[PDB]
DNA sequence: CCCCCCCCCCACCCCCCCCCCCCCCCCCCCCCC
DNA sequence: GGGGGGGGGGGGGGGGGGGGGTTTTTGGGGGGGGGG
């Protein structure tokens, strides 16, 4: 007697694919998830009673916003979506549809039946979208076949590279010649359906109809080229990669590098032999058409800043692995810290330099400082494998180097006396302006670096000579070593007082399982988000007559900005506003110690 | 500029109206109904909408006809 | 006999075209796996009636109006539109073989091959195998009357418990030093 | 430190399409019942 | 006064014609590195 809304090829009806969505989105409880997976003893009423898709609506609706993420477990987690669940992998694109309006149908029935007052407009005007996700495994890129030319799918990859937003018509625009009389037609399939005659009874003209291009109304479409990723290859042939479309927000959800889970319906379409033909080629093009996308606190912090011993606390913290050099800790903890800017230039960097014997802690130090710093990178000092330290034009571009990568972060340059020449130079003008000069190809600019520099240096031949300065074992030359706030060595002279502590302490890492470690990052964080020191009125007349004290002792006034900026740093610890007498002190104190060398 | 203001919000109306007559997804995710009808047999249609709407359906499946009747014309 | 045989790829003369043969060769590369079209399947909008294309070539032209009676009898000039879910694809793969260091005759470069891989036997085929594969050696048109020609592959030849088996080797002792002798044994 | 070397990057058939012609269909007008 | 038939216009379909469809060597400049 009435007719039946079938999902096509299915026998499947919409109508109930609708409601046991509905009977899921709403009266659903998070405790049922629990029931499907492993530990289910961990099921509590207080924190799993809770009506999660009921939540997630509310919480999305005052946002205003339009996506709902959805673990494609909690169907088979629920009686009446069981069922759905094989029909959202089978058939995606239907059951997906019937997914969104029912989520706008949510939308609009909570405003009436929840009955708050609310811009009906608004959610009627809005449209809506779930993404699936965690459908199931993720199988390989290589391992798609045929039979998976309309499911629901997931793959993880490497991102290459992707297109600009493509413009993809979702409404056509279309003015009559004759009468000016407008209509709006949707696009369906792709496919324009052009009115052969106009609309308007009193006009109806043959062919007068014509689109009116930037009328029309536009989606944004996206391609985006993934990699397989090295870990499922075998061993002896190139990658596969796949090309996915991805539309709407969730274009540009990754960039070139990203390691990235998608979930979306594998697609297959044919392709021309030539574009004024509609002759097609017999074996189709394959891509993905993404619904889901996914990559790979103040009261400790204030607790903590209380702390009397804290300066050597979070120096040992940032290398307890290594044995004792507990200067050199506390000088990259300083560096790690950093000082102020001001407008007017003068900035926050701090730059450290060790040198002595090649086989020892240093390289260990450099790679602690890499793993904690937010935003920095290592290097060496010459040389390419695809990451160099200046920036370079080549095919026509502009590539960064290391340095001008590390803007906001340490640069780590081991091999810093092996640096090549014209590297050398490149090195004054971030050590001095913190920027690089470009001026090629049309483009003239200074490249800001902003990156402060730990290096690490060796002795030429084997061993470091104590009895000799540093400018005669080093090969880099005196005015760039000036540069370094701090400079240090490090030396593999024999001493069992030592020696047998340092094996020791090695060997006991292999056996073990305060140290703030992991903390560290996250009070770094907070310090340099919050606190911006200011110098004290007396603190001036400490830095003068220190400064006069070491001159009557060679110093210059790069000595006594150094001295500023580092106990700038010394006041971002301890969280202090203002840099105090003794912040000065010990700037004062630890550069005294490095420029004795 | 009041007026205007009138102007605007009803043309809005229109706005919201072919709102629901748009897919809320892109033009390619095409998924197929089929409206069986009454009787044992099948039509079928893409509107991404018009899955959840009979209405739609049978108005789209009207309009995609290809066929026109010809129609009639009509100084100092 | 000739399936039997393990021709090279220069052996491979015009003579052999349509007839089942094995190619003994070094797959160099191999395509990922595409879908192929053998029954492109179309909805009918204006009568739901679909219909069907089977497609034997390396293209095809798409259909537009509804041939089906369900629509010509009426002359109803209604719309088809490809579906995929519908249509049957096939697993299909394109390799190329390449004849081994001892079939190339004196100065000669050697010569190779396309193999076409079609169903199951999809992915059988790894860069870097020495394998025998039979199949139907035949043409495929663009040159003029100079065709194209490739072997559609038909049966694969490849030329090349422990947790328990492990125990022979820690009972049978010394195992360090005979396992030392073992890296290259021959050198002294 | 200076000069020279050497290294790098760069320049004929088949389909789509358009035009022309013929027939059929639909409307309007006039006559007949 | 309404319905049928005849005649003219307008539209659609079918047919026919036509046109389009990358590595390797050589030279030069500039940059980088090594030896006296
Ligand atoms: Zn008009
Ligand atoms: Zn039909």
Not at chain 1, 95 to 104: G, N
Not at chain 1, 342 to 347: E, H, I, L, N, P
Request: charged share 25%.
């Amino acid at each position: 007697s009435e007719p039946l809304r079938i999902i096509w090829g299915t026998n499947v009806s919409i109508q109930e694919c609708t409601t046991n969505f509905r009977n899921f989105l709403m009266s659903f409880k998070y405790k049922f998830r629990k029931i499907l997976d492993e530990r289910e003893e961990f099921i509590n009423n207080t924190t799993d009673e809770e009506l999660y898709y009921i939540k997630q609506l509310n919480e999305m609706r005052e946002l205003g916003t339009s996506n709902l993420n959805l673990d494609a477990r909690n169907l088979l987690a629920y009686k009446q979506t069981e069922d759905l669940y094989h029909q959202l992998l089978n058939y995606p694109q239907e059951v997906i549809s019937i997914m969104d309006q029912t989520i706008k149908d949510c939308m609009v029935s909570l405003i009436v039946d929840n009955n708050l007052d609310y811009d009906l407009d608004e959610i009627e005007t809005k449209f809506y979208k779930v993404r699936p996700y965690n459908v199931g495994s993720c199988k390989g890129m290589r391992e798609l076949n045929p039979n998976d030319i309309d499911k629901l799918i997931n793959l993880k990859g490497l991102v290459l590279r992707s297109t600009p937003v493509i413009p993809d018509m979702k409404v056509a625009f279309f003015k009559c010649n004759v009468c000016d009389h407008t209509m709006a037609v949707e696009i369906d399939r792709g496919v324009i359906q052009e009115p052969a005659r106009c609309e308007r009874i009193d006009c109806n003209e043959p062919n007068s109809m014509s689109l009116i291009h930037n009328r029309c109304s536009f989606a944004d479409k996206q391609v985006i080229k993934l990699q397989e990723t090295p870990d499922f290859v075998p061993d002896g042939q190139t990658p596969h990669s796949i090309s996915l479309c991805v539309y709407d927000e969730l274009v540009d959800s990754c960039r070139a590098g990203d390691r990235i889970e998608v979930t979306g319906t594998f697609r297959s379409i044919p392709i021309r032999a030539n574009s004024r033909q509609r002759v097609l080629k017999s074996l189709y093009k394959t891509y993905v058409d993404v619904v889901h996308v996914k990559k790979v606190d103040l009261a400790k912090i204030r607790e903590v800043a209380a702390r009397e011993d804290l300066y050597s606390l979070l120096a040992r913290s940032i290398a307890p692995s290594i044995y004792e050099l507990e200067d050199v800790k506390k000088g990259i903890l300083l560096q790690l810290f950093g000082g102020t800017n001001k407008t007017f230039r003068y900035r926050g960097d701090i730059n450290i330099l060790l040198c002595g014997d090649p086989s020892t802690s240093k390289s260990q130090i450099l790679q602690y400082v890499h793993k904690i710093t937010p935003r920095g990178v290592y290097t060496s000092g010459k040389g390419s494998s695809a990451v160099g330290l200046t920036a370079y034009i080549t095919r026509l571009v502009l590539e960064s180097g290391a340095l001008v990568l590390s803007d906001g972060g340490v640069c780590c340059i081991d091999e810093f006396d092996k640096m090549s020449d014209s590297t050398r130079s490149v090195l004054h003008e971030v050590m001095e302006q913190q920027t690089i000069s470009i001026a090629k190809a049309g483009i003239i600019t200074t490249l800001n670096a902003r990156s402060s520099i730990l290096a690490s240096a060796n002795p030429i031949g084997s061993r470091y000579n104590p009895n000799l300065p540093v400018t005669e074992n080093i090969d880099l030359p005196p005015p760039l070593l000036s540069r370094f706030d701090l400079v240090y060595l490090v030396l593999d002279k024999v001493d069992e007082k030592n020696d047998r502590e340092l094996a020791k302490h090695l060997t006991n890492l292999y056996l073990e399982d305060v140290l703030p470690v992991e903390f560290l990052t996250m009070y770094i964080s907070y310090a340099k988000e919050h606190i911006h020191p200011i110098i004290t009125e007396a603190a001036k007349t400490e830095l003068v007559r220190a400064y006069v004290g070491m001159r009557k002792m060679t110093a210059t006034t790069r000595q006594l900005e150094s001295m500023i900026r580092l106990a700038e740093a010394h006041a971002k610890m301890k969280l202090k506003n203002v840099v105090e007498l003794e912040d000065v002190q010990e700037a004062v104190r630890l550069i005294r110690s490095a420029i004795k060398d | 500029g009041f007026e205007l203001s009138k102007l605007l919000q009803k043309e809005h109306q229109m706005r919201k109206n072919v709102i629901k007559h748009t897919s809320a997804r892109h033009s390619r995710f095409g998924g197929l109904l089929s409206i069986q009808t009454p009787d044992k047999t099948r039509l079928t249609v893409s509107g991404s909408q018009a899955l959840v709407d009979e209405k739609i359906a049978l108005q789209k499946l009207d309009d995609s006809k290809k066929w026109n009747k010809r129609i009639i014309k009509k100084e100092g | 006999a000739i399936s039997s045989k393990p021709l090279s790829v220069r052996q491979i003369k015009g003579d052999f075209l349509g007839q089942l043969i094995t190619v003994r060769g070094i797959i160099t590369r191999v395509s990922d796996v595409k879908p192929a079209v053998e029954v492109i399947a179309y909805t009918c909008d204006q009568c739901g009636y679909e219909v069907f294309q089977e497609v034997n070539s390396r293209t095809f032209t798409p259909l537009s109006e509804c041939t089906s009676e369900e629509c010509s009898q009426n002359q109803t000039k209604g719309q088809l539109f490809m579906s995929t879910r519908a249509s049957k694809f096939s697993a299909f793969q394109e390799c190329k073989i390449q004849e081994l260091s001892q079939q190339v005759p004196v100065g000669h470069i050697p010569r190779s091959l396309n193999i076409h891989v079609n169903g199951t036997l999809v992915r059988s085929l790894s860069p870097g195998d020495i394998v025998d594969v039979t199949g139907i050696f035949l043409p495929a048109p663009y040159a003029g009357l100079l065709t194209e020609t490739y072997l559609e592959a038909q049966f694969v030849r490849q030329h090349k418990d422990v947790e328990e088996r492990v125990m022979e080797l820690i009972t049978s002792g010394d195992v360090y030093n005979r396992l030392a002798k073992s890296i290259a044994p021959e050198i002294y």
